[PDB]
């Protein structure tokens, strides 16, 4: 049971870090690192149940993903439930390639 805006971290080794992947209308895709910051990273981490983000990484730090680039130039206030609720260029709007895939490092506790 997955809905639009649902997220997951991949290829991180641990469960509290990885490449950010997000669901939309039936498929998973990645997020471009343009303007990717710590406030954006904390929205992902808290949604996934961690206390906070410690690092917002870009340039496919956890490897390049596959699928469409879902979001780009994400500007969160920090109080959002999902990256889908943050300001961005809109779903599927991006000129980036997977080598720009954004990632995060969250707290163990449960610029670009
Ligand atoms: C999350 O971590 C950053 C790092 O300094 C901090 O500014 C922020 O207040 C922390 N907590 C929350 C709930 O955002």
UniProtKB/Swiss-Prot annotation:
This is Galectin-3-binding protein. Glycans are attached at residues 52, 108. It is found in: Secreted; Secreted, Extracellular space, Extracellular matrix. It comes from Homo sapiens. Residues 7-107 form the SRCR domain. Disulfide bonds join 32-96, 45-106, 76-86. Homodimers and homomultimers. The multimers form ring-like structures with a diameter of 30-40 nm. Binds LGALS1 and LGALS3. Binds ITGB1, COL4A1, COL5A1, COL6A1, FN1 and NID. Interacts with the gamma-tubulin ring complex (gamma-TuRC), composed of gamma-tubulin, TUBGCP2, TUBGCP3, TUBGCP4, TUBGCP5 and TUBGCP6. The unglycosylated form interacts with PDE4DIP isoform 13/MMG8/SMYLE; this interaction may connect a pericentrosomal complex, made of AKAP9, CDK5RAP2, EB1/MAPRE1 and PDE4DIP, to the gamma-tubulin ring complex (gamma-TuRC) to promote microtubule assembly and acetylation. Promotes integrin-mediated cell adhesion. May stimulate host defense against viruses and tumor cells. The chain holds residues 19 to 133 of 585 of the full protein. Ubiquitous. Detected in body fluids such as semen, milk, serum, tears, saliva and urine. Expressed by keratinocytes and fibroblasts.
């Amino acid at each position: 049971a997955v809905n639009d805006g649902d997220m997951r971290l991949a290829d991180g080794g641990a469960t509290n870090q990885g490449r950010v992947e997000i669901f939309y209308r039936g498929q998973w895709g990645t997020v471009c690192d343009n303007l990717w910051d710590l406030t954006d990273a904390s929205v992902v981490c808290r949604a996934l149940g961690f206390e906070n983000a410690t690092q917002a990484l870009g340039r496919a730090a956890f490897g390049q993903g596959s699928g469409p680039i879902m979001l780009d130039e994400v500007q969160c206030t920090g109080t959002e439930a999902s990256l889908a609720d943050c300001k961005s260029l809109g779903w599927l709007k991006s000129n980036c390639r997977h080598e720009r895939d954004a990632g995060v490092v969250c707290t163990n506790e449960t610029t670009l």
